[PDB]
Amino acid sequence: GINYNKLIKEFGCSKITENHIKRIEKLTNSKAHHFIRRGIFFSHRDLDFLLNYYEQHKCFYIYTGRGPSSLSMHLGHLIPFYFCKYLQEAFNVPLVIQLSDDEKYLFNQNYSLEYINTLTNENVKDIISVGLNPELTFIFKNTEYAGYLYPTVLSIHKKTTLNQSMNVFGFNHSDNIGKISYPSFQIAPCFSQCFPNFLGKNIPCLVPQGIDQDPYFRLSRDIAVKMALHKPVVVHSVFMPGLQGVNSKMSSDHNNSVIFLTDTPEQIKNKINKYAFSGGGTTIQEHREKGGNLDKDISYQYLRYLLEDDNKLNEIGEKYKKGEMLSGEIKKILIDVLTELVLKHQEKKKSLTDEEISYFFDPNKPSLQKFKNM
Amino acid sequence: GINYNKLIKEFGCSKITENHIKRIEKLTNSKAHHFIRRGIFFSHRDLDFLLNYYEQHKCFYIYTGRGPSSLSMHLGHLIPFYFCKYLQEAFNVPLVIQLSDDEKYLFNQNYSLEYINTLTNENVKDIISVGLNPELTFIFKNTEYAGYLYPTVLSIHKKTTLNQSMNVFGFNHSDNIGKISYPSFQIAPCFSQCFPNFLGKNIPCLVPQGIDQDPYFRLSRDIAVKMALHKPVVVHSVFMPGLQGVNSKMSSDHNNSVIFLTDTPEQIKNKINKYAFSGGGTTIQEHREKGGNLDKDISYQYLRYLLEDDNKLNEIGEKYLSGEIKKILIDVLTELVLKHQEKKKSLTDEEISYFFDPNKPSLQKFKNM
Ligand SMILES: Nc1ncnc2c1ncn2[C@@H]1O[C@H](COP(=O)(O)OC(=O)[C@@H](N)Cc2c[nH]c3ccccc23)[C@@H](O)[C@H]1O
Ligand SMILES: Nc1ncnc2c1ncn2[C@@H]1O[C@H](COP(=O)(O)OC(=O)[C@@H](N)Cc2c[nH]c3ccccc23)[C@@H](O)[C@H]1O
């Protein structure tokens, strides 16, 4: 399994605490998202600075991204985006979303820019369909927005030796120079000068991410000091596991470990019933006696990510732990929850117009520009 | 010295020939510029393809550039630009000019972007003051125009291993990744898809340059094949030597080997009289007997670049008094430099801005090739 504690201490982060949560709830006048309460988003750098800044200036922005390497995203890919939806609503601040189409063109030898773009456009619909607030969201493709990033990229480039790049990201001498140079493009949007149409200069940036993105942003913090700009504030998520077991990451038969957003209710039912690891007894008699293992049961673990009502989760968790609820029942609860989530997602996605989509790419929205001088 | 013949064969170029010149004169209905006639621009790749292309389609574009590393350029820096002025007039085609401010920011550790920009703006005036046709010219700064270049840069990046970049340009592991990645930005404008406001896609590109730029464009030709786009056509110039001697390059006490465009008539006179190498005899008696060495005399060599009238040059060349030939050069330089400064001083913000406008109708002539 992934020892997340050993990552905190090795990468140099701090755990998000109960007092961080209360503080957040005080500043946003709203219950904190379950991801924070339940330790999904569990780690940070400079969170207190950010919260202090928001308290004084009612102002920061949120940055996250998606590398369009596949036509259809899975549930794990949406964790950061659901969290950004919450952050955006609760704090009432802009959210900027990078589609690193350059990255995925550069890293996949047989993929054309044209092919990457079909993936990007579909991915963007999936991203929008989580319910992002169009009025406070700016999505951009690096292939189209590089002109705005480049001056900042130049400064980041200048402050990154080839040695550092190769060491931090594990590049070798046969890698193309696009790969060597991409990380500066992922780092750039942490600096509000990249969005002059709607942000003031040197506004703090909150960067929600799965823990795999940290090498970029750990580097970004060193470079920020050299640029005399705010260090990016990071909050890291654990990985949502695959169905096969908790000691894994949901990734991409191998698609039987993954819930795709294009999956039908039929396919979801079958994946859960047949492939989702059960933490219960092998017999009903044994289950009644020993109970369910919550740490290993995939359906319970998934319910931690998806079920908004705390009481309902603790009710299910206690019954399953005690043996009062069967593996068949908890799997059935998950399926109903997933089916609802996925059907709502597809309903929203199908309904998106070109006009609605294009609006997310418009940097001159008045609601976005409220922080332009702020 | 620089053995230019050994470069041709090592880099893989071909010499420009008399038949290339005649061919050019036939197609442009105009005498060829002295740089070609006198072997200043001496080397090329795919020149015949370009000339044939122009004959069939009356269409190509010219690309060259300047790295703004100094507040004022010297005469050597203008050689390519004078030549582009001619090419632009003679062929009646667009000229695009890259200011590689990104390059010079990235290669000079103590230079800020803000400092580079003061240099760029001054350099741009120097470039314009050569007499470029504003109606057929597009100047751009990489810091401002990168959005238009990036898709093409990505493809060039993808087709360049770190090994290649390091080999071709001599980078090491302590160089910043900006340096490693810059060459693709220098290469990109060779592909007309970078100028969608005024060029059609996949239009041939003629790239005049001093021979030091060739590593970029030799690479650009290999990559062009992989991108299934036209290979850039190159024409290379020798270096205008420094005053110290012919075995040199004029390069930005060490400024006594260089004629800057900000130099006064007083400073020019002194640099020539005091520092310009003389190919005359050491004694007056010896000079009478052997004559001047034209191959080594800096003042004669400079006159090959600057004197437009062939007869006047051949008259001076046959006769060759070191004091007199130096005095001829000084008058020629002083005129050139004073005209240049006159023009430069006269440039308005409006005139300058116009060069950066990609939507000029005269520029859009080839938009639908
Ligand atoms: N099983 C999982 N459970 C929870 N989270 C997960 C899971 N799998 C992936 N993630 C997170 O989803 C985001 C997008 O992943 P990508 O591979 O597109 O991610 C990429 O290819 C990036 N280079 C794109 C990017 C560009 N700029 C950014 C800024 C912040 C974060 C990400 C980016 C990521 O945050 C990732 O950590
Ligand atoms: N003594 C000399 N005699 C004759 N030619 C000379 C002499 N010194 C310099 N040159 C030529 O001047 C141009 C600009 O030089 P830079 O160092 O700014 O050149 C640079 O720093 C480039 N990276 C800028 C650039 C960007 N794109 C281009 C495309 C073509 C040519 C040049 C560029 C060059 O053509 C150079 O060969």
Side-chain angles (χ1 to χ4, degrees), chain A residues 102 105-106 108-109 111 142 146-147 150 154-155 157-160 162-163 166 173 175-178 184-185, chain B residues 102 105-106 108-109 111 142 146-147 150 154-155 157-158 160-163 166 173 175-178 184-185:
Chain A
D102 51 349
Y105 169 64
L106 291 168
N108 293 279
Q109 187 58 30
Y111 288 7
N142 281 346
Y150 192 50
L154 286 174
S155 178
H157 278 348
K158 197 170 179 179
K159 297 162 180 62
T160 306
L162 181 56
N163 271 328
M166 295 185 88
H173 293 85
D175 284 325
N176 70 69
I177 62 177
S184 302
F185 286 82
Chain B
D102 50 350
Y105 169 64
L106 292 168
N108 294 281
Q109 186 57 30
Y111 289 7
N142 283 344
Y150 192 51
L154 285 174
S155 179
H157 280 347
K158 197 170 180 178
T160 306
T161 68
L162 180 56
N163 271 332
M166 296 184 86
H173 293 85
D175 285 324
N176 69 69
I177 61 177
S184 301
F185 286 83

Side-chain angles (χ1 to χ4, degrees), chain B residues 9-27:
Chain B
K9 205 193 165 227
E10 178 98 44
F11 288 167
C13 308
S14 318
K15 277 190 195 219
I16 296 168
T17 68
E18 192 76 286
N19 290 6
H20 284 130
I21 289 159
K22 292 274 279 173
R23 173 102 164 116
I24 284 163
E25 295 181 333
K26 200 167 62 58
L27 294 164

Side-chain angles (χ1 to χ4, degrees), chain A residues 42-92:
Chain A
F42 74 100
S43 155
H44 77 83
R45 292 196 267 253
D46 283 332
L47 184 50
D48 287 292
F49 158 83
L50 185 90
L51 298 180
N52 286 4
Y53 196 92
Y54 180 73
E55 190 173 42
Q56 298 313 303
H57 305 303
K58 291 288 188 229
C59 169
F60 64 89
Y61 75 111
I62 306 158
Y63 162 44
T64 199
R66 158 71 185 156
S69 56
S70 184
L71 190 49
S72 47
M73 314 186 181
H74 52 64
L75 212 41
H77 290 136
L78 295 191
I79 299 310
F81 289 102
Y82 290 126
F83 196 53
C84 289
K85 181 189 165 185
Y86 154 74
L87 290 166
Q88 181 178 61
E89 266 156 11
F91 287 94
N92 198 30

Side-chain angles (χ1 to χ4, degrees), chain B residues 137-152:
Chain B
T137 310
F138 179 65
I139 309 181
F140 61 97
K141 298 172 186 188
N142 283 344
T143 50
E144 293 173 340
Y145 199 66
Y148 287 85
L149 307 177
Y150 192 51
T152 301

